[PDB]
Amino acid sequence: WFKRFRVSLPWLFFISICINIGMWFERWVIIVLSLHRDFLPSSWGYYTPSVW
Amino acid sequence: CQFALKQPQEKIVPYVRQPEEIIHGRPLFFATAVTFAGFGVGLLVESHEGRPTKIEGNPDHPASLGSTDLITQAMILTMYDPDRSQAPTNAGQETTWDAFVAAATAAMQAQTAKQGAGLRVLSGSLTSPTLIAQKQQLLTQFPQAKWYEYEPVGRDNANAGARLAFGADVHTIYRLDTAKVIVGFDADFTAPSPTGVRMARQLADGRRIRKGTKEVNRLYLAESTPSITGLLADHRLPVRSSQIEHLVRALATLVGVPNVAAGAPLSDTEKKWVEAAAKDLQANRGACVVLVGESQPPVVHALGHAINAQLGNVGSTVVYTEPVEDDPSGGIAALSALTQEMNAGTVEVLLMIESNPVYNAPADIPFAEALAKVPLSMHVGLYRDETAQQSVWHINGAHFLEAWGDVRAFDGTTTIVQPLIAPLYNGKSAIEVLNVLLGKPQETGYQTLTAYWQTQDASGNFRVFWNTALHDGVITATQARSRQVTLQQGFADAAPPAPTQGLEIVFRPDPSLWDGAFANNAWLQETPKPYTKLTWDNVALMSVRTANALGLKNGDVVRLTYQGRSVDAPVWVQPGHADDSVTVHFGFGRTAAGRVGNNVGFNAYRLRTSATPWFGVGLEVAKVGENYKLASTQGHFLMEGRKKDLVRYGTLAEYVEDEKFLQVEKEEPISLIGEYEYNGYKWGMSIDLNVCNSCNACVVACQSENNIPVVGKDEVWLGREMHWIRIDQYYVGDEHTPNVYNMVMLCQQCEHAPCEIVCPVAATVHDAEGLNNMVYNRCVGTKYCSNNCPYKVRRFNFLQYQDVPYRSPIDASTENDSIPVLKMMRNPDVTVRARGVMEKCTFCVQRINEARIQARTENRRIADGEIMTACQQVCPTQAIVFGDLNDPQARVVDLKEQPLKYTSLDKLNTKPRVSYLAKIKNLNPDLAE
Numbered sequence A: 001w002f003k004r005f006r007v008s009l010p011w012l013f014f015i016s017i018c019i020n021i022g023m024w025f026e027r028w029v030i031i032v033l034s035l036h037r038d039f040l041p042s043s044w045g046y047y048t049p050s051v052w
Numbered sequence B: 001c002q003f004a005l006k007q008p009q010e011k012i013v014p015y016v017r018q019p020e021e022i023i024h025g026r027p028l029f030f031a032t033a034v035t036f037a038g039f040g041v042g043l044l045v046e047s048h049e050g051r052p053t054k055i056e057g058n059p060d061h062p063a064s065l066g067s068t069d070l071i072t073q074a075m076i077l078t079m080y081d082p083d084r085s086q087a088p089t090n091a092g093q094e095t096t097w098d099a100f101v102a103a104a105t106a107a108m109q110a111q112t113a114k115q116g117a118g119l120r121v122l123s124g125s126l127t128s129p130t131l132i133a134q135k136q137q138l139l140t141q142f143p144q145a146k147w148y149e150y151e152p153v154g155r156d157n158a159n160a161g162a163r164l165a166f167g168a169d170v171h172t173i174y175r176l177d178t179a180k181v182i183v184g185f186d187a188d189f190t191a192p193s194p195t196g197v198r199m200a201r202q203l204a205d206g207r208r209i210r211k212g213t214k215e216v217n218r219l220y221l222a223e224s225t226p227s228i229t230g231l232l233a234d235h236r237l238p239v240r241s242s243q244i245e246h247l248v249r250a251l252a253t254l255v256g257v258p259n260v261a262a263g264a265p266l267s268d269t270e271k272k273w274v275e276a277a278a279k280d281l282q283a284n285r286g287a288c289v290v291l292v293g294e295s296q297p298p299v300v301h302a303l304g305h306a307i308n309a310q311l312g313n314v315g316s317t318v319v320y321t322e323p324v325e326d327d328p329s330g331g332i333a334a335l336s337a338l339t340q341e342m343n344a345g346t347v348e349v350l351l352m353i354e355s356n357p358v359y360n361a362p363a364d365i366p367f368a369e370a371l372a373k374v375p376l377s378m379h380v381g382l383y384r385d386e387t388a389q390q391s392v393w394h395i396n397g398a399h400f401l402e403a404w405g406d407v408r409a410f411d412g413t414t415t416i417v418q419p420l421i422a423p424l425y426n427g428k429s430a431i432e433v434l435n436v437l438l439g440k441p442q443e444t445g446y447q448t449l450t451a452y453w454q455t456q457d458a459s460g461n462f463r464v465f466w467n468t469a470l471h472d473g474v475i476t477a478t479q480a481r482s483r484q485v486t487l488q489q490g491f492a493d494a495a496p497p498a499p500t501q502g503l504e505i506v507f508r509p510d511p512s513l514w515d516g517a518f519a520n521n522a523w524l525q526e527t528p529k530p531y532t533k534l535t536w537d538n539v540a541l542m543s544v545r546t547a548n549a550l551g552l553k554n555g556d557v558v559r560l561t562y563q564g565r566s567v568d569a570p571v572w573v574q575p576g577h578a579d580d581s582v583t584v585h586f587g588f589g590r591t592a593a594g595r596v597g598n599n600v601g602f603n604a605y606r607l608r609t610s611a612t613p614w615f616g617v618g619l620e621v622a623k624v625g626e627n628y629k630l631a632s633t634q635g636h637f638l639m640e641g642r643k644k645d646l647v648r649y650g651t652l653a654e655y656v657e658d659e660k661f662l663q664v665e666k667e668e669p670i671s672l673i674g675e676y677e678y679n680g681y682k683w684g685m686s687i688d689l690n691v692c693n694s695c696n697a698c699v700v701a702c703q704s705e706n707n708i709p710v711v712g713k714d715e716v717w718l719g720r721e722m723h724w725i726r727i728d729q730y731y732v733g734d735e736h737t738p739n740v741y742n743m744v745m746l747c748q749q750c751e752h753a754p755c756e757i758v759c760p761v762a763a764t765v766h767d768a769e770g771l772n773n774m775v776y777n778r779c780v781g782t783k784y785c786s787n788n789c790p791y792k793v794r795r796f797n798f799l800q801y802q803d804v805p806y807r808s809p810i811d812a813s814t815e816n817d818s819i820p821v822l823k824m825m826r827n828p829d830v831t832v833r834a835r836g837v838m839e840k841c842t843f844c845v846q847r848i849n850e851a852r853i854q855a856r857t858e859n860r861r862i863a864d865g866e867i868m869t870a871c872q873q874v875c876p877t878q879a880i881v882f883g884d885l886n887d888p889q890a891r892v893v894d895l896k897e898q899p900l901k902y903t904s905l906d907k908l909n910t911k912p913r914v915s916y917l918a919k920i921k922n923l924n925p926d927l928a929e
């Protein structure tokens, strides 16, 4: 909202680098947190990713 | 990634002399039986040409009424195991079979110089009349020879209790079809026992709840650990396994037993349980039964016959017959009388029919050091076991599909074990190995089987009698004669000692792997254990209150220190369990099982002490580990408010006032997609959840029928088990005394299937018959069907899941190369699936089509019993009922108009073909508070 953190490129970079990490986490919350726990409790998984 | 422009030149070979009976493409069922403990289960196994591919139940047989156990069903992968002993082995290196009959007969002429002294045999608890007649020929040719019968889950205390109350040994055949209450006492009788399929049908026949049913079974249990009868128990009590000798002494005094001498008092919830279980025993005297399993000492087993003779059950539901097994007074004490004879010489020949006592012996019985003192140790078993390395000689086993044999079931009914296939590796069964020791080495297994039944047939025309016995399976000219008994007095006069404080150990057989004889079976391993849905791990079962006192979570490795031995056990906490009563399971820790059962759990047999062989109170837990793997396959054992959608549970007190009290009389849902018209062969399924004891026989029969791959322990922990049908425990209530409810969750074959609309290449469509068609060759592998499937009954092949306990699935060096002997166990009507396709319960569409197409050639329609799926043909309780829904006089159209018919997830408009009959758990008025 403030121009103090929009014209200042060391502040706009930290804001935008927290969106690429953060909007990855939105698509993690949408995909994994809806899939790993669902209707039936006997099909509740975790998805810790591997190296690949 | 296999790739070619053409498939290679497929050779089609005929026979060279095609036998008359074989039609290529037709199943050709054969009537055999399996020696489980010593008794027959009775089988109807499907041999396509020579190879048996699917074990079913022999519906003529008394034990299995057309339905097998979990272990009995998975004897096909044991048959086609590549880890089976392919050749005899002499002192480590391989050899021939006729080198054995030149070494054994050279040791049999040295025994006739003596009075056959060093000729001990260590078979396991056999009941078969041909091996009894061969033993009684062996013990009359060699006078001082001894036949010891060791069985780790033998009926040792069950027969010592029959000696302690009746004098001589008597066999006890229970009969639950005339039984209103069944007051068990540490008796998992619906387990894989020699009578577990009949005692599960007779218990479930009493509680078939219909539109006009007012009286069902009750099943007071009082179990040590949560056992699979506790799913059918309505008043299961977590007793410490040392107080069950004192609950019966509190129940034998409420009924009339004069010399009970009760002691060691009870708690406020074990005493109000036993004043109400015995109050329902003094009523309905003609139809009631008190059961007690071999975990208990021989005194309470004798008291269990004292109560059943007081209440007048003898002749009504507890019949007493002559003992079907040959040596009932020989068990662990027979193994201990052999090693003290095996020490300091004085034994020269030790035949070991399939027992595996190097692995199975108690710690107080030094069978390892007593072995290799025998100069000629011979072993007969279908695996190179823990004993076969420590034996001098070793023979193949001739697994019962390969060998001519007999077996006697309970009720005494003999059933002939025909070979469905010739021995792949030349097996030389137990009837053929005693032929070498007797002196007839060229006599085949068939030549000594009909030599016995020609002399045990007092009728004429033996060829009609013999061919009918192979056809029907059963004989029933040989049933065990009912014995008049006495019930002698003055047997429980001695007061018991003080109940010793301390944390108790409890020994159990695992329902999957009974005593480690089938620990090399991949179908039994990945099949989830009944309460604690684990696959490849022995665990130490603790209560929630026991682990809270010791301070250990659901995955810590503890070093369970018994009287002198430590075992280094992982921990699985368990809500239904008793306090301070840590339970370990047999069947694990095998060091020479093969490639499946090598080093999967901890060997619980190193803690048996042969004086406390099932439970003892001197345990020290002493946690020494953290964060074990423990590949479980459930995710959440707690119904999270999803009742009305998973297991609708009620009692009979509220069902006799309101029929549809668990139904929701709601308005018809609105669907924008319209609907389709299913007018011919509408296929639906009704799963009666009230009678499912979570036996897991339907999990492993879908596996044997639908070619489902086994998945190793590392990929079950990632939730990639391949199981088309699953049973779901849910643990409703208090975390110390809960109610455990099963939901048999398979593919519901949804009419408005959400898994189909999300398939880009249309690899999942419907029939006009109505069931969901998962076509594997079209699946490109986009796992979106699994995401939109609300029940998550879709199961993706992630890696190349094929022969996974024999090659780890994280390689492509053997991805498209398969084990040749495992190819014979596969059903030829189900696609053996590739690396990246998804699976689903297809209502056994290869069984639907093979009788739909056959009913079209003969221009008729399918009847009701013509199509019976694999999960339906295996369920001992007959919980699953499949059939036509457009047939008005069908069996599933009655079961889907019952007042307990509910579908899972009707909040979504999937419109399933699978409806569930709800659970009603018959609570007593004096105990429901």
Ligand code: HEC
Pocket: B849, B852, B853, B854, B856
């Ligand atoms: C070459 C691949 C091919 C396959 C695979 C195939 N058909 Fe058929 N098929 C039929 C007829 C007619 C029926 C009988 C339909 C019925 O009875 O409902 C049938 C039925 C079937 C059935 C049995 C359906 C059931 O209810 O059991 C199967 C399976 C089948 N076809 C498979 C005419 C054909 C023709 C026509 C010359 C061709 C070519 C043909 N079919 C080619 C093929």
Ligand code: SF4
Pocket: B746, B747, B748, B749, B750, B753, B754, B755, B756, B772, B788, B789, B790, B791, B792, B793, B794, B840, B910
């Ligand atoms: S129950 Fe699941 S797998 Fe079966 S048709 Fe419906 S969405 Fe598909």
Ligand code: SF4
Pocket: B698, B701, B702, B706, B724, B725, B746, B747, B841, B842, B843, B844, B845, B869, B870, B871, B872
């Ligand atoms: S009916 Fe379906 S779930 Fe049941 S055994 Fe057959 S394939 Fe498996």
Ligand code: SF4
Pocket: B691, B692, B693, B694, B695, B696, B697, B698, B699, B727, B744, B874, B875, B876, B877, B878, B879, B880
């Ligand atoms: S449905 Fe039948 S086979 Fe499956 S767990 Fe229940 S009782 Fe056992």
Ligand code: F3S
Pocket: B758, B759, B760, B761, B762, B763, B764, B778, B779, B780, B781, B782, B783, B784, B785, B786, B837, B838
């Ligand atoms: S959506 Fe379609 S192609 Fe394969 S795994 Fe799922 S089916």
